[PDB]
Ligand binder design. Structure first.
Ligand SMILES: CN(C)c1ncnc2nc[nH]c12
Ligand SMILES: CN(C)c1ncnc2nc[nH]c12
Lengths: 204, 204
């Protein structure tokens, strides 16, 4: 059971821009994902001040980076607040327009995060993104897209607790972001101080 | 009718740090306020995608900077989502601790915003802050504090629509942030691209 949806026309345009605009500084994507993760963690955090039961599906608030050279994927995991099916379809489906009206006036792509639309920076480095997610008031869901104007949503076995898993299947010329000294350099450089623990998994 | 509350002990410590730590680069405060404002606007924005009635108390989404040399105040106004009485008391009343554990390891104060606690940067420049606020599901409220460990909350006449007014009564040696070329320099330098219109009021 698999639903296919059209990206809203402007998200398709924004995404097109990110895939086709020549831009060497692709690395800013990680910061944009870690950044989203942090916001998600701030969210389950603020909520659980007035209502602790919410951390019944995970007490620990943190971020994992999981490289896998065999699949050629980099997974950014958090145990933040998660997405309901509706959010998956909206949130990931007007900060874009500003962004272009900014891209007109001497902004560049590295400012993408300043416009609510950092997620889509994943497309600098990834041929296909899959987003597994579990919000406290819904079941677990899988979202996916290799761009080209559509996405899919299906319910996910293999239950995570509350949280989000952003899986990057990397473009073949972007496997440097699977290397450990590459990831550490990027985290130190762009996300050095951030209110949650970040674990970089090792391989095997 | 005026309630006085104690800041949670760590907020009092964080605030103390900001008032007594020698740090010349005080200007980063504006970016931290404009930044909060923007988040508030993102919030009423996301909400109103699924439920337009919410913008019944204000269709227009924007930020005003209102300098007044007679009162010696700089007001940062937004028509974002607002705060309920509860949020006033919490939200403005653990990103702090991280921040210190970061301040230990070579971070400085300019990173305050990376830790959820940018609001308190107002204290670099302001002897007293007043925050007038109106959330869709509550009446209008005034919050206040000259630090020293407490704040007040009272209901506010003079109704704003939905939104937040952060009033800075500036320290007497900080009146440069009332000058127009000073504000423009700071907005251009630190908040140049941001998803909402910013109006700098002129004086008279
Ligand atoms: C909408 N958006 C980017 C997100 N919302 C909630 N949790 C997340 N974890 C990573 N990205 C997330
Ligand atoms: C908690 N916090 C800083 C705020 N929440 C909502 N609206 C705001 N406008 C300025 N600051 C705001």
């Amino acid at each position: 059971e698999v639903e296919t949806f059209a990206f809203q026309a402007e998200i398709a345009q924004l995404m097109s821009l990110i895939i086709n605009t020549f831009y060497s500084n692709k690395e800013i994507f990680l910061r944009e994902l870690i950044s989203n993760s942090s916001d998600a963690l701030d969210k389950i955090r603020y909520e659980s001040l007035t209502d602790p039961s919410k951390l019944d599906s995970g007490k620990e608030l943190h971020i994992n980076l999981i490289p896998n050279k065999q699949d050629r994927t980099l997974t950014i995991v958090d145990t933040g607040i998660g997405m309901t099916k509706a959010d998956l379809i909206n949130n990931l489906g007007s900060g874009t327009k500003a962004f272009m009206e900014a891209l007109q006036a001497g902004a560049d792509i590295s400012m993408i995060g300043q416009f609510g639309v950092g997620f889509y920076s994943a497309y600098l480095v990834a041929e296909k993104v899959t987003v597994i997610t579990k919000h406290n008031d819904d079941e677990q869901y899988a979202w996916e897209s290799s761009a080209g104007g559509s996405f899919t949503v299906r319910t996910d076995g293999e239950p995570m607790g509350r949280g989000t898993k952003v899986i990057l299947h990397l473009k073949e010329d972007q496997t440097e972001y699977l290397e450990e000294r590459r990831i550490k350099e990027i985290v130190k450089k762009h996300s050095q101080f951030i209110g949650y623990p970040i674990t970089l998994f090792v391989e095997k």
